Amino acid sequence: EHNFQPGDNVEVCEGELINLQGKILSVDGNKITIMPKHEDLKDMLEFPAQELRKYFKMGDHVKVIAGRFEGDTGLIVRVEENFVILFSDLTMHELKVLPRDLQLHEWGELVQLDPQTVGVIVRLERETFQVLNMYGKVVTVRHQAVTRKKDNRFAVALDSEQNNIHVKDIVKVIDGPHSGREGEIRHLFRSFAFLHCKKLVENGGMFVCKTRHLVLA
Amino acid sequence: GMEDFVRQCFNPMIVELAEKAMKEYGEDPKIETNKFASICTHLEVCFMYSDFHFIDELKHRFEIIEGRDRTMAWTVVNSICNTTGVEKPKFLPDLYDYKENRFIDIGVTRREVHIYYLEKANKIKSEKTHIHIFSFTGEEMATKADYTLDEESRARIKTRLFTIRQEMASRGLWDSFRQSERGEETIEER
């Protein structure tokens, strides 16, 4: 077989142009007339569709073209006689390929909406999750549009009387929109907490209050 | 004719538990046989879930809360919660795992897994009640992606579900199982 695709980093396998490295420009139907723009070369040369191979230098980018490791990407890290080893970008999976084979959320879990919008999932839908954010607004977000956030079960904050409060603590709300309510701290930050009250039917009892609006019950 | 197929394609004691339960709840099992088949398959899957798995240094690791009368099931739940301290789930669970000391609810569905899963999660309000969901099409999914079972056991369960699906389709009532009415409750006191 012999197939060439534009944009690949190739080399010259024979002739006076041997070892020259360049990037493919175009491709044709049968006589590909592949033309590689060599590095630091203003001119463009002509090669047959069998004289060029996909070579890569140490520290460059590569993406498998065919075979068992198709779809993996990374950076070659060694050049043996012919085998080229690299490590996958997405994971640490080892990858050994030829140079020619390369080219050039549960109900009530804290989620990240944005750096400053660590929301809590309050409703599961087929494609989206309702998320009560720290400001008291409910937003709808796609399942893949949010990341699961590591809960800090040992967080500590100050309440309205500068008492230490912790996750799982029962507090009363003495200010703000939820003044008068009582709840269990589910997720705690220095300035606000996500609370639970079973008597509160809205959002399944999940509400949010500033920590300075709380007092330990 | 499907009820005979259910009788002949199930363990005798599983079908016995299904029929006794239904009779406890006061439903004629000769008419609404879809609920009969659903209950039988659910019990069967729960038994497989609690089959061959033992806790030891042999004891059954999983106690099958479903399949027993209401008072006995709630007695089991209360005893477990009083000894281990696990919170009493207001909804009757289906199994209890001693190693993780937490109840499990098993559900078999022909619809996509995630819709049933989210429905159950929302209903339970996620009051520390892990749930596992199987499907007849041959995929599984549980809370936090924890199945607490060896790959081979889950494979056996899913294969059994797929086999019963193919047998029932051979009987041609697969579309019939896809229908379940709210309730035809019109039993006037005569």
Add this chain to the structure above:
Amino acid sequence: RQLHNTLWGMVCPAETPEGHAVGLVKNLALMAYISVGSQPSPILEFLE
């Protein structure tokens, strides 16, 4: 499209569409009869 003088008794001066077909689509008068046709051989024989 104009109502020619020769439409007297042969076509209705009033009945005609008022759209883009004014005067083109006509309607016969009550006593108007369109001839069916006849062979001229007997007339030619009489004239000869």
Add this chain to the structure above:
RNA sequence: AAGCGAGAAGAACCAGAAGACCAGGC
């Protein structure tokens, strides 16, 4: 102020023409 036998929830749950022509209102 009243006050004379008991309860709670197994399983799982939509549709396209398009084109031409004719009549017609405005």
